[model samples]
Target chain A: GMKELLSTMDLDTDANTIPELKERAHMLCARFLGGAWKTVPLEHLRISRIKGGMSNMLFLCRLSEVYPPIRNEPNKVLLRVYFNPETESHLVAESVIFTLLSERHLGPKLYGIFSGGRLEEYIPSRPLSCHEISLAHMSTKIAKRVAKVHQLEVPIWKEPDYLCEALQRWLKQLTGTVDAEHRFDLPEECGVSSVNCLDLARELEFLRAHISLSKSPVTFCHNDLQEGNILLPKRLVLIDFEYASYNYRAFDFANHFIEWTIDYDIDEAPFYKIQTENFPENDQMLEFFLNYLREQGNTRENELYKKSEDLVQETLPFVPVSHFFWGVWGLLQVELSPVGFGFADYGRDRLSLYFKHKQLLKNLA
Target chain B: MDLDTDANTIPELKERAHMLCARFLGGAWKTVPLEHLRISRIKGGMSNMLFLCRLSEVYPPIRNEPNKVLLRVYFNPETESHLVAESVIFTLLSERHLGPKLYGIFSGGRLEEYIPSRPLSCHEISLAHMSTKIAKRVAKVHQLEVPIWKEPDYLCEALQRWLKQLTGTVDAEHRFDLPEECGVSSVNCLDLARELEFLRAHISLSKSPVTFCHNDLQEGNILLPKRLVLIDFEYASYNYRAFDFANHFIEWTIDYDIDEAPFYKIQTENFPENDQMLEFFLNYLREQGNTRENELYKKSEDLVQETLPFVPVSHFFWGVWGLLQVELSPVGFGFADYGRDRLSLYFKHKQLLKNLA
Candidate 1:
């Protein structure tokens, strides 16, 4: 939710003396929580930047340790400032998802909703690490969690129609001068010289045609089920439904499996680890499939593995698509986004993997 | 320590809005009683409701003590998410002083800077003096570089949405059919869809720049204080510069309340000819300091020509808009006639297309 009038000052995530941030938080706290929050000084309001919300800049706004809640809205709030212009349209969708999930006891309680950012109930939680998400027990839990998310029918358009059109829009923007050339200035070590964006556009057309043939059930997809998106406090509340869409169920599974191989939490030049070997092996993936079908009330042990194999087949084609979608996404981020992600390297890896797996799919066919 | 009685309707609005004002904008009026507040409802807004809240005892204006504030009560929860998108657009424009000041925001509502003003009536808006000032005002507005999806299809998209919203039912019911006396064939879902598609195909073909547009630039949307301030950004978006010009010009012909005679008077004679169009464009270009050349060095005539075909689009947009309003069961604005007249103009304007002639 929104805060009191902060001046013409657009909230900068990199500021140290952002008295504007504190004042805004103080106003929201007073408005939402009332009581002790009303009397809390701007200086006394603790504002700390929370790490790892890739799409937006996040800050934790709380009363100082001495203060306690007497309220409906909690004592602490999370401020999510949408930094990406590309995702601005999705902010409404995200807010809707947040409110829906909050009411269902599935997501954070929204304290205040605003234009620039929103105030959310600060759940004391930690995001699942990349290493933790790959473990067998943890893997099964997330499978159940994602199935629950899929069970939801959000009021937005219910179709598997987003990925292709989104990529086409991205490609259209890439064709803009100064935008496309930024994609090719890559290091040789990443094993990609220059992706033919024209080829990417054509590839999108092919994928759109093929994804149409996917008999996979269409359901709500989290779209980005990266480790940073899952919260374990410890009921496994899935966060960041910015990309949640009524998409092919297999695409969701495909994207989640792809995450098993890539670690975004690493430091250094690449800033993400791509362990080609760790891509969820067949048995590991089968484990997730069984649990998912089981949660959906489909636990006939005789039929489980056979249906699980069907999901594996359904998920494979979407793998290359997931690669292509995020590949184009990374290039877009490199051009338009001001975020300090390893976008160039990420784009190179993902686009290359799109070809690598696509050739494999071709070989299998 | 007393249990308070629950308020309803107008009273409910005042109490809730008063509390919002008191808490969000705390310093002096934070502890002031509801009885000590002045809440005046500002109507005529088609999208959301508004309230002018002030202290009964005039308090001095300061950083902490904002004595007056405007409360915007949104219409529906289904539309609230879309409202946040508007909020983002409003906040950005507000920062640039191109729009009204947003004091604070919360669920289903917001506290805005109560820049005391009445809307510029349809009567005075076409005056050269008024039009020129509005040109300058609009010129400042069009310069906003909002960080939104820079698609120029919002006008067509809106026309489509409202078209479907009306035609979704009325095509089943007989109410959507036009009369033979209106000097035209009745509108059908088939033709309206095709006409909108026609605009969609050609609007993208035009050489207009996509800019942050006050898509609803009719007289009521223009809040006139000492200066002409654009208000009610419900339909604001990154849209064609020509669409904005076309909408405002067509709005010149519309008197939303001609003694409230069926809620409108569409005077065909009031549609700006090339002469009137040129002067407003001249003022707009003068504000932007662009010489009369298309180095993208823009000519007033260039804008006039660019805005011409779009006149039909505005007709279609408001025409379908009226149909939806009628079907939506909103008012006695003679919305069916409003729809009929505009669609009639839209088809008439089709004659402007050189191929048709």
Candidate 2:
């Protein structure tokens, strides 16, 4: 999570050395994991920096003496150093969720949780790409993974209308800070001049009214479903659950659909110009829904197909809602964060697409 | 041979403590390298149990390996909040390099660095060099800013509470524990009450500036080897400076013998009076860079003189403390006999002071 936040900054000169990282890793491992790190020498321990470090710093560590040993478990471990201080409660909640998920074999095995962060079993597989996630086979597998998460008894507090609640929070923050001339340096390039914070207030009210009438059951949803978060081994593994919560089922599916058009290969992927053209059509979405039902042990094809069609239609209305939610999130990031991403441009793009999607829905009506 | 401290207690209590220690220490001491883990029980813990836990040598030798840690399990479950406050105080003191390095803290216990030094004996505490070092150490403690609110009548309040307990039904049944020589009886409870009123009327005995005090400063808590270092901060609090000096002066009278019957003996000559106490008090002030001509020295000297009357008050306080300990303490000790000895000593001191007055 810290890594994602740090992405927009220049990390070229300030990255920590392996020895410095090893010292902290040894202390945490000794403190929590039975003092095994004390017996091992620094030279014997292998350390590699994981590609990204957003909200948390990530490192892959492997002890030489214990290599190629355990069955169905990698000897390598991932150390995550947390950076965001404000989400103490959320981090605690995440730890519980991580432990539960690991016990059920739904996620990575947790090694230890310490003051700043946690140690987890590093999966020896590559993260899935944007092209790979769009495949029908991968889509089905991804759907089953989502279904597995939804099936688990999380017991965490459920926010039924989390999207609106989040948007409302962001809107409130913007109302407090947004000014015509002095603050939030309204980016001139995004064409966001003469912006009215009231537009968001009205958009949120409309979303609330539209959502209440919908039959989307509240489930444990991985609220962020971008391709970078999914790993592809022999099996599909989901990672980075910073935003997992009890939210509307339609929102999860809709959020993943919005992510389908993202070209993650681009350096500015998180805040890149999202391709508005590449969303899954009705047939493909129905196919994905059918796979999810099958994974849930439903086999009656005709009845399942009818249910999947309505689910697809229900998910469609939430697409604009997802755009609005992420847009405000990006905008807030722009104002409050020093993260180097193009938050203003990305937020403007998302809000513009939301307006386009709303018009498209009206035309269909 | 395994010399375990846990063996002294009841099986259930021992098992509970063992389980707690194992759970907290599991990460650090997964496999005790030695076959027999030698655990020697340390004495003089009034409200807690202290043990020196050391692992046996590794079969296959490894040099520079660390092995020893002190395990302290709080005995009084009712005074848990007090124990917690003590740990917080100990942490601050430890950070300031005043006490042992705290290793880890669990729910009911803490692991501390086991300093391989013996506690100061009664004779060692009286040595001029050790006494001067202790004066310096005490001066350092007095200068620390107390983190919690200082209860001005903390000592008096505790004494009164214990006095009330003596008159209660619990101690009434064990009134035989009150020695006849002390002249304390059901009827004389009123006399003890009158003495307490007289002490309160002589309020100047406690009229000193509030400072961080080692409220239970005695030989047991002060360890001696190369230097004098204080331990057992369970009785540490913010209170009158004179009480600590007077309490230490009174403590010099008593010495414990672990051998036979009549476990403790009191000697009056060991108690430092006006002249000897003045020298020690001056030494303490000198350590803080306050010369004899300074206002602090005069104030400190006056406070030391003020402490003489509180000497009897200190005996009364501890006598009441011992009575409360008879029912409250979980550690096996002769609390009833201890209470009788303290009250007898209190009466002897009171009579002696009356003759002087």
Top candidate by TM-score: 1
> Candidate 2 residues B125-218, lDDT tens each?
7777887788888888887653333444556655666667666735333444355666654324455567676656554334566677888888
- How much is A196 displaced in model 2, in angstroms? 6.0
DockQ of each candidate relative to the true complex:
0.04, 0.02
C-alpha lDDT of all candidate models, in order: 0.70, 0.64
What is the C-alpha lDDT profile of model 1 across B1-357, one tens digit per residue? 001223223567667776677655655566666676777756564445566788766554444456877777653222433555565555555555656665555555667677767888886889899999999988977886443444565676566666766667664535455545545667677777887877777777777776778888889878777567778777787777988998899989988756454667878798887898998998898898755445323488788888887788778787787676665543335767778888888877764433222
Model 2 off-target regions past 4 Å?
A1-26, A38-46, A52-57, A64-75, A81-89, A114-117, A159-161, A165-202, A268-273, A334-340, A359-365, B1-357
For candidate 2, write residues A40-82 as lDDT tens digits. 5666667776754233457777668754433233346788765
iRMSD per prediction, in order = 15.8, 16.8
TM-score of chain A of each: 0.85, 0.79
Clashing pairs in 1: A1-A112, A1-A113, A1-A119, A2-A112, A2-A113, A2-A114, B293-B297
Residues A128-217 of candidate 1: C-alpha lDDT, one tens digit per residue? 888888998899999999878888755333457778757777777776734444445434454555656776777788778777877888
TM-score of chain B of 2: 0.80
